[PDB]
Amino acid sequence: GMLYHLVMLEPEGEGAMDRIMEAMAILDGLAPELPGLTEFRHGPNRDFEQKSERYPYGFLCTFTDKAALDAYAVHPTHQRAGGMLVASCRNGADGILVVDLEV
Amino acid sequence: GMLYHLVMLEPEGEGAMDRIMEAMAILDGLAPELPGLTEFRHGPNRDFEQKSERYPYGFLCTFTDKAALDAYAVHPTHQRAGGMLVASCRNGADGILVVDLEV
């Protein structure tokens, strides 16, 4: 079963978006190197209906399967990028919403 | 200018999911008739990191542009299905998170 991994971010502090944007470039580089991560996309939340105002930025990974998601989890590039995101968000990991939709 | 429209649901009540799957079937049949809606997916949130327990189900629509999202917004068949989602979630539309990532 195919997994859409959605990560919504709550930036907090001076240089939070800058660091997040470096983390996005780090993850753009990683995606092509992981065969089970078929698509990686990121951007501002335009929130046209004003129903997610807490999360001004997010990203999406599409994985072939759970093995692919786990390969991504553990890769040193992603652990570094993940650390940077946690350092850039409100109350750390608590300012990061992660959904894993099986589609 | 491509838009990822993500809807996460908080079902509330007996028969909430039953109605949500009815609304999903409506959107499955509509998506193919909306040419700027290039992909429509949905399923349960496995939430492997326990970081989104609130939202057991969700869906993603990929739109080519804002005009495509607007065409979906105003389509009477989408509105029917969206009213069903609202009436199936906790405290109405309060139980629905909607992101629009511009990617």
UniProtKB/TrEMBL annotation, chains A, B:
<protein>
    <submittedName>
        <fullName>Stress responsive alpha-beta</fullName>
    </submittedName>
</protein>
